């Protein structure tokens, strides 16, 4: 439960494996998240080579040494990932840069982006009755209810991610019992991102992704339209945010802990 993968073979190309995993402090040995080649010819030696590998630009993201020093046993656990429309999504739990503060996230990449410039990461969770739940324990993509479709103003085509969460942001390794099922329509994620990108491209705010950037980087104001599916440039990336994507709670309990969905 620290690794997840999505195989994306959109038509025309050999297709690829998008994979994220825990790397237990070996920031040199294994990338935290990468896209590998999963080629047609089964015989091929191309198997699990990085989709791109120059000296600098590569289809991989490595946890910097700076962050692994500044936070003790720093890692990123990947719980779920999915193919949706033009994008790949990964759901990640990690300790947080300065008790034990953990933060569940949504990671989004374009299916066709080797430079990994499309990267954008926002925290997610859901809250009901004053209590808040921010420790992702499971997730699962599916079609929306009829009820749920009217709720989110999505078609009965579009995807909804159903997730489970624990109370607060304390001890992921030794979790409590207060757990909560909630639904996130992809359209909401795709739009909450679209507006995050939007503002940041008008000089507004910061990149706000300190585990990978290791410092503060100011959003660059640029005349670039953030069309409905925009796939990053070499500016304003990787993109973060500290403005949770709130999901609609569906059910809670504190007698029993919830594990799967």
């Amino acid at each position: 439960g620290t690794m997840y993968g999505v195989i994306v073979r959109s038509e025309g190309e050999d297709g690829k494996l998008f994979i994220g995993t825990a790397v237990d402090g070996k920031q040199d040995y294994f990338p935290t998240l990468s896209s590998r080649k999963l080629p047609r010819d089964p015989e091929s030696s191309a198997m699990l080579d990085y989709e791109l590998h120059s000296d600098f630009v590569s289809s991989l993201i490595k946890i910097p040494s700076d962050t692994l020093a500044l936070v003790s046993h720093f890692d990123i656990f990947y719980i779920y990932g999915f193919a949706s429309g033009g994008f790949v999504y990964f759901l990640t739990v990690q300790p947080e840069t300065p008790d034990l503060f953990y933060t569940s996230r949504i990671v989004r990449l374009c299916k066709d982006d080797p430079k990994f410039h499309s990267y954008v990461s926002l925290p997610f969770g859901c809250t009901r009755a004053g209590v808040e739940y921010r420790l992702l324990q499971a997730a699962y993509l599916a079609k929306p209810g009829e009820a749920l479709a009217q709720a989110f103003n999505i078609s009965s085509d579009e995807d909804v991610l159903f997730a489970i969460f624990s109370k607060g942001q304390k001890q992921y390794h030794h979790p409590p019992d207060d757990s909560a099922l909630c639904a996130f329509p992809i359209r909401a994620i795709n739009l909450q991102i679209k507006e995050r990108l939007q503002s940041c491209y008008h000089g507004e705010g910061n990149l706000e992704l300190n585990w990978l950037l290791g410092k503060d980087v100011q959003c660059t104001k640029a005349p670039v339209p953030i069309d409905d599916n925009f796939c990053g440039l070499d500016i304003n990336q990787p993109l973060g945010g500290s403005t949770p994507v709130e999901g609609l709670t569906l059910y809670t309990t504190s007698r029993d802990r919830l594990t799967s969905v």
Binding site: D28, D55, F56, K62, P64, S65, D66, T67, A69, L70, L213, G214, K215, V217, T220, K221, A222, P223, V224, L233, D234, I235
Partner: protein
């Protein structure tokens, strides 16, 4: 109690000037190869044939043109950069051999590198990447050095300029970088200069100091070494990354009960010989937000080497202070000792280094000592000026017998400062001597577009032509080393100027400079500067 700003011995500008011949030139650097002055600028490289009788205006001998593709400008502008920022500015210009120039440019924030014919300046071959070879921004400072046919470079890899690196590429040798996002290695550095000397290359930069960040952010000047024979680590540690990177703080200060440091390194020279020592000269200054001062400190290349043989630093608890390392825990072979030396000839290539050595030099790039200056203080100070001191040019054989060394200092308001490196009674090196101060900038020839940028950006002394070339972003100026007829027929102060370029010749009865026709009686006092009993003006 802090030494007063001293006065020049002697007390304007109508020298030759080069303007291209009208647009801005945006000169980025000057250089001299063989007998031609190169002027690397925007969209161009201009040359001047130095020897072609330097006339009223200096005229463009041969030319070069490399503009940015219209496509490349579009993407640039689109990323939210300015109109004048998106051009091809030449930031790298290196002589590979007798036939090849190696030129890179910003190329509107899309750096790329070409090879050019030394003769006609026509391009040839495919263009390769300018990543980590040349800056994206025209304004950033960069290190470009050819040594052993390999390109040692230091700048940024990305448009955003987050990721700074010291990089070695080309020359059939595998490619080496400094560890990415590791501030133990590089923390937001500003690269000033690098030089070739021994089995090592020495980069001079400045960074946010990790030792003294105990309180706020502090900047330190640094000197770092790399082994020319570096081949990268094993398979477990530092593969494709330097195995000989050690850095050390430089010490440029006026000592007191508490010493006042100069940290903002502006310029380092190439290695020079002064008093039978291999030395470099660096200018520094106070942080931008502080009372303005500048110093010039000199460094013996042996002492630089000596610091890398000393003790390393380490930070025990992630919150504890920086303690020296007891030699008991330094492993063998010595971290940062070249592959193939005393005892280390048992190691054929750097790939064979054990895990002990490698995992150590990855974690301890910083040396405990701080390279000390010659005479343990600045050779020159300015504390009561509005400008900082920047560019630095040296003359290690000025005077008839060629045993005096004259140092030229460039500023930001065009003011150019000239001092003589003093020899003590002991014979040892001992302070300096503020000879002359002169303003070189020409408002009527260099303030022509919306531009008046009195900042000196490149200096090149040419003893062969008997001149020093000073480059502003708008123009290049040919200043003669010694304007001796300035002091006049008044013999009293022609001698007192103590200018190694000047003296008295009795056959003419006035003050004039040294000539290759060395048969005539040339009378000068430099070491004593004797005024005693001479007719006044």
């Amino acid at each position: 109690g802090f030494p007063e700003d001293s006065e020049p011995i002697s007390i304007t500008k109508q020298y030759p000037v080069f303007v291209g011949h009208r647009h801005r030139l945006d000169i980025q650097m000057i250089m001299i190869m063989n007998r031609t002055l190169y002027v690397a600028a925007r969209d161009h490289i201009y040359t001047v044939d130095i020897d072609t009788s330097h006339t009223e205006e200096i005229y463009c001998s041969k030319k070069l043109t490399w503009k940015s593709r219209q496509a490349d400008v579009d993407t640039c502008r689109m990323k939210g950069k300015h109109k004048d920022e998106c051009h091809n500015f030449i930031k790298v210009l290196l002589k590979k051999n007798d036939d090849t120039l190696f030129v890179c440019g910003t190329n509107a924030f899309n750096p790329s590198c070409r090879n050019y014919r030394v003769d006609t300046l026509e391009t040839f071959g495919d263009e390769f990447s300018g990543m980590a070879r040349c800056p994206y921004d025209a304004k950033h400072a960069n290190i470009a050095l050819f040594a052993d046919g390999k390109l040692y470079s230091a700048t940024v890899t990305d448009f955003l300029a987050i990721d700074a690196v010291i990089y070695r590429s080309l020359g059939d040798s595998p490619t080496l970088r400094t560890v990415k996002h590791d501030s133990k290695w590089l923390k937001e550095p500003y690269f000033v200069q690098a030089v070739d000397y021994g089995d090592y290359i020495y980069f001079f930069f400045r960074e946010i100091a990790v030792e003294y960040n105990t309180m706020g952010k502090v900047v330190f000047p640094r000197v770092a070494q790399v082994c020319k024979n570096d081949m990268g680590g094993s398979q477990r540690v530092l593969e494709k990354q330097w195995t000989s990177f050690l850095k050390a703080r430089l010490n440029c200060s006026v000592p007191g009960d508490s010493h006042f440091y100069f940290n903002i390194l502006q310029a380092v020279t190439d290695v020079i010989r002064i008093n039978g020592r291999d030395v470099v000269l660096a200018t520094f200054s106070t942080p931008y937000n502080s009372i303005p001062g500048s110093a010039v400190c000199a460094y013996d290349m042996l002492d630089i080497a000596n610091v890398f043989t000393g003790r390393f630093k380490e930070q025990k608890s992630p919150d504890s202070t920086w303690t020296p390392v007891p030699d008991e825990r330094v492993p063998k072979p010595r971290p940062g000792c070249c592959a193939g030396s005393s005892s280390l000839e048992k190691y054929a290539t750097s790939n064979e280094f054990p895990d002990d050595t490698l995992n150590f030099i990855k974690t301890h790039p910083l040396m405990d000592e701080a390279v000390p200056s010659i005479i343990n203080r600045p050779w020159f100070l300015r504390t009561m000026v509005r400008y900082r001191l920047t560019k630095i040019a040296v003359d290690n054989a000025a005077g008839p017998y060629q045993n005096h060394t004259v140092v030229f200092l460039g500023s930001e308001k065009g003011i150019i400062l000239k001092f003589l490196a003093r020899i003590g009674s002991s014979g040892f090196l001992n302070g300096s001597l503020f000879l002359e101060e002169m303003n070189v900038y020409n408002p009527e020839k260099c303030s022509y577009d919306g531009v008046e940028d009195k900042r000196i950006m490149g200096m090149q002394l040419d003893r062969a032509s008997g001149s020093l070339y000073v480059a502003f972003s708008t123009c290049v100026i040919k200043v003669p080393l010694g304007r001796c007829e300035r002091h006049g027929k008044c013999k009293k102060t022609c001698i007192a100027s103590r200018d190694p370029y000047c003296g008295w010749v009795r056959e003419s009865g006035s003050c004039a400079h040294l000539s290759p026709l060395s048969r005539l009686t040339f009378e000068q006092d430099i070491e004593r500067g004797n005024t005693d009993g001479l007719g006044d003006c």
